[PDB]
Design a protein around this ligand. Structure first.
Ligand SMILES: [Cl-]
Ligand SMILES: [Cl-]
Ligand SMILES: [Cl-]
Ligand SMILES: [Cl-]
Ligand SMILES: [Cl-]
Ligand SMILES: [Cl-]
Ligand SMILES: [Cl-]
Ligand SMILES: [Cl-]
Length: 152
């Protein structure tokens, strides 16, 4: 695997409050030149993955985008519900990162290597920010290193 990706450590955030949510830790490591940060670790919720798939389906190769786990008719917090959604998210990313065309998606790179919100990504990839995509990812890499990933 030229790109290593793992969706791990799912957690119910703000448990019990009106705006509780589940998010997922995304770990990536690659030597590919397409990525600004050689290693990255972010947290994202399912609703952001749904947005990310829509961005990817606008690609110029008309390449298929892997399916996501289904949407829920309830707020799911069971261990089994969360694990199966975690498995499907990892499969989704593993498949996405095997496509050269999808590796040109700037939103994907900010999704994976920064903690910018979805609107912030949209503003950055539309030329409405002071910083470039590469600058944002590099600054996050300096800000977010915590020595959890040893070189091989
Ligand atoms: Cl809750
Ligand atoms: Cl990542
Ligand atoms: Cl979620
Ligand atoms: Cl969500
Ligand atoms: Cl960030
Ligand atoms: Cl925002
Ligand atoms: Cl990083
Ligand atoms: Cl780290």
């Amino acid at each position: 695997e030229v790109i290593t990706v793992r969706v791990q450590d799912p957690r119910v955030q703000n448990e019990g409050s009106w705006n509780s949510y589940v998010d997922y830790k995304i770990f990536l490591h690659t030597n590919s030149k397409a990525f600004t940060a050689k290693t990255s670790c972010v947290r994202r919720r399912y609703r952001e993955f749904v947005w990310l798939r829509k961005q990817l389906q606008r690609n110029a190769g008309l390449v298929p985008v892997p399916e996501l786990p289904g949407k829920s008719t309830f707020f799911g917090t069971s261990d089994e519900f969360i694990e199966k959604r975690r498995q499907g998210l990892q499969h989704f990313l593993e498949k996405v990162l095997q496509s050269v065309v999808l590796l040109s998606d700037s939103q994907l790179h900010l999704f994976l290597q920064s903690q910018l919100s979805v609107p912030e990504i949209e503003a950055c990839v539309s030329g409405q920010t002071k910083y470039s995509v590469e600058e944002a990812i590099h600054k996050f890499a300096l800000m977010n290193l915590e020595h959890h990933h040893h070189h091989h």
